[PDB]
Amino acid sequence: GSLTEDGLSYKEKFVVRSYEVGSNKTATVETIANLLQEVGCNHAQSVGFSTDGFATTTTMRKLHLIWVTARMHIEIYKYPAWGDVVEIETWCQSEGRIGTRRDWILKDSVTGEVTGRATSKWVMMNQDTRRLQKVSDDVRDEYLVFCPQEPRLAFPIPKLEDPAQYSMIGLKPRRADLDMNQHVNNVTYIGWVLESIPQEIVDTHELQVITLDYRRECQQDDVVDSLTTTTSDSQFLHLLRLSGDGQEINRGTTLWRKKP
Amino acid sequence: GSLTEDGLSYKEKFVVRSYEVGSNKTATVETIANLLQEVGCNHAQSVGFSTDGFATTTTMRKLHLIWVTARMHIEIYKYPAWGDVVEIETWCQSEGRIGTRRDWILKDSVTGEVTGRATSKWVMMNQDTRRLQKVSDDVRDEYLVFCPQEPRLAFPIPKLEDPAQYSMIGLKPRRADLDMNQHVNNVTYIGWVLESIPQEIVDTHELQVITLDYRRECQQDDVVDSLTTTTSDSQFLHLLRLSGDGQEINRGTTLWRKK
Ligand SMILES: COC1=C(c2ccccc2F)C(=O)N(C(C)(C)C(=O)Nc2cccc(Cl)c2)C1
Ligand SMILES: COC1=C(c2ccccc2F)C(=O)N(C(C)(C)C(=O)Nc2cccc(Cl)c2)C1
Numbered sequence: 001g002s003l004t005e006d007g008l009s010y011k012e013k014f015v016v017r018s019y020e021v022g023s024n025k026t027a028t029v030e031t032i033a034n035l036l037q038e039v040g041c042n043h044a045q046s047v048g049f050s051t052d053g054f055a056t057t058t059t060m061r062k063l064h065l066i067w068v069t070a071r072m073h074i075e076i077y078k079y080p081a082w083g084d085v086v087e088i089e090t091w092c093q094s095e096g097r098i099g100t101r102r103d104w105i106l107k108d109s110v111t112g113e114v115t116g117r118a119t120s121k122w123v124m125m126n127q128d129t130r131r132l133q134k135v136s137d138d139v140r141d142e143y144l145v146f147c148p149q150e151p152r153l154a155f156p157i158p159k160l161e162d163p164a165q166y167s168m169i170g171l172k173p174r175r176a177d178l179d180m181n182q183h184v185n186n187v188t189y190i191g192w193v194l195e196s197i198p199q200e201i202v203d204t205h206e207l208q209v210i211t212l213d214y215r216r217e218c219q220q221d222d223v224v225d226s227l228t229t230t231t232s233d234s235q236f237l238h239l240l241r242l243s244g245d246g247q248e249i250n251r252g253t254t255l256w257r258k259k260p
Numbered sequence: 261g262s263l264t265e266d267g268l269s270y271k272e273k274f275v276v277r278s279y280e281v282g283s284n285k286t287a288t289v290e291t292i293a294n295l296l297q298e299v300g301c302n303h304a305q306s307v308g309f310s311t312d313g314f315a316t317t318t319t320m321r322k323l324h325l326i327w328v329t330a331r332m333h334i335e336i337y338k339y340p341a342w343g344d345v346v347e348i349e350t351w352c353q354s355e356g357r358i359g360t361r362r363d364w365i366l367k368d369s370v371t372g373e374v375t376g377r378a379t380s381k382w383v384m385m386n387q388d389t390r391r392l393q394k395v396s397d398d399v400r401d402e403y404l405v406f407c408p409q410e411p412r413l414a415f416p417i418p419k420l421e422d423p424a425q426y427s428m429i430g431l432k433p434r435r436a437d438l439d440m441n442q443h444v445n446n447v448t449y450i451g452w453v454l455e456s457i458p459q460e461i462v463d464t465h466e467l468q469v470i471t472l473d474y475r476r477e478c479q480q481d482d483v484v485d486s487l488t489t490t491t492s493d494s495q496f497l498h499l500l501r502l503s504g505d506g507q508e509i510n511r512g513t514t515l516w517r518k519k
Contacts, residue, residue, distance in 0.1 A: 023441075
């Protein structure tokens with residue numbers, strides 16, 4: 001893939017692999033999430049940013065500062081099939097002092113149609129303390145030249161109450177869930193959320209919308225419980241929290257549609 | 261990718277993705293294993309076989325016969341970095357009535373240097389009974405025209421004894437570990453085997469050789485314990501078995517080099 005003509009977004013193509021699809025012979029939402037993240041890293045790299053802390057600038061690397069996801073919103077109209085070519089376009093936009101925002105459009109490359117959209121909200125925090133920080137003029141000066149200045153939107157949560165309707169308890173990060181900087185991969189949260197969805201609902205529906213609000217990061221030795229209640233098509237409320245009624249990790253919602 | 265000019269091997273290039281590497285900033289052995297499997301399905305697809313039961317022929321699908329892995333042997337000289345282009349060549353070879361073999365060669369597509377080698381033995385078994393069958397004439401006829409006929413080798417285990425030195429217990433297949441027809445991905449076993457390797461050894465060594473004997477498949481609702489004992493660079497003996505001192509899933513060995 002590469003930067004577009006104007007140098008303000010990034011495009012990449014992927015052939016959906018055999019291991020990347022589940023029952024429906026289409027890409028899982030974990031595959032989609034991974035490709036969104038891959039095209040992100042490729043955009044960051046192409047303009048000279050580091051993946052450690054997700055597009056670290058100079059004054060950032062200097063201050064041990066990183067971006068982490070406050071929120072991920074993914075909506076899939078159609079999941080690409082095994083052997084299909086999907087095209088993903090991504091860009092980043094400033095959100096003043098709140099933080100930054102990365103957006104994605106997924107297309108069937110063969111046919112040009114929009115098959116998916118994503119948006120994410122990122123905030124600056126300290127790498128060592130894990131403490132959040134607003135965007136100063138000096139850090140915005142370093143990235144603003146890589147972002148469209150005019151708005152460009154891909155898209156122009158309650159705490160779950162005890163008792164949960166459904167649970168998957170004692171979820172542990174495995175070594176393959178850890179990235180190059182030994183951090184639990186964001187795509188893991190999506191899988192842990194869906195693990196508490198009853199097998200029958202996965203078997204007869206497709207995920208159309210997921211929203212995740214990230215509260216704190218799971219470490220490598222942590223153990224997580226995934227809690228789902230029906231709120232409704234089929235709609236669900238989600239909570240990830242540390243084993244032993246520990247702290248909230250994530251909350252989220254999903255919307256599923258019946259298979260054809 | 262595509263078949264080679266003689267039509268008897270298959271070649272595919274992969275660009276190593278960010279999420280495919282761990283700490284060393286090189287592709288994990290799991291990523292390697294996944295790319296081996298993918299060039300495998302692409303090969304089976306290229307010559308008209310079904311990916312379900314890992315390259316089934318017409319007679320096989322008729323008789324409810326699939327290929328299962330008996331053994332997987334992988335050696336890595338060098339793990340490709342984030343951004344590197346690896347090229348994998350793969351071919352299959354008849355082992356008469358016992359089954360078939362698939363071999364791979366990995367290459368830095370820039371230097372054309374051999375960065376790794378894999379070999380696998382696959383046996384024929386009835387989907388339903390899980391009973392092993394020797395390969396008939398009618399099934400061999402259907403695939404032998406797609407295999408080199410002269411030998412082509414990419415490479416020219418005891419039961420672990422209680423107590424285990426290291427263990428990781430209660431390992432469960434997650435939804436993402438299951439393939440398109442609800443089978444636990446063979447590559448899952450590699451990850452589980454390595455989960456009982458202590459972190460300090462993974463931080464200070466890279467894996468050079470792994471060998472796995474597959475005894476039976478883990479189902480979606482199964483729970484597995486990963487047991488490892490040092491036998492030695494560092495060598496290990498491994499055992500996956502179902503929780504509750506259940507049946508053996510896998511045995512294997514790993515050899516690790518210092519960084
Ligand atoms: C440097 O400033 C940032 C950019 C950026 C701006 C212009 C050009 C290139 C950029 F990376 C960016 O995308 N940032 C956020 C945190 C929103 C991000 O999504 N990072 C990110 C990195 C890797 C992977 C993924 Cl999935 C996300 C910060
Ligand atoms: C059809 O007969 C078989 C071939 C075959 C022979 C010639 C041309 C193409 C082929 F697929 C083959 O490779 N077979 C075994 C079981 C050894 C295999 O590796 N399958 C396999 C499929 C997908 C992925 C993976 Cl990781 C492995 C059986």
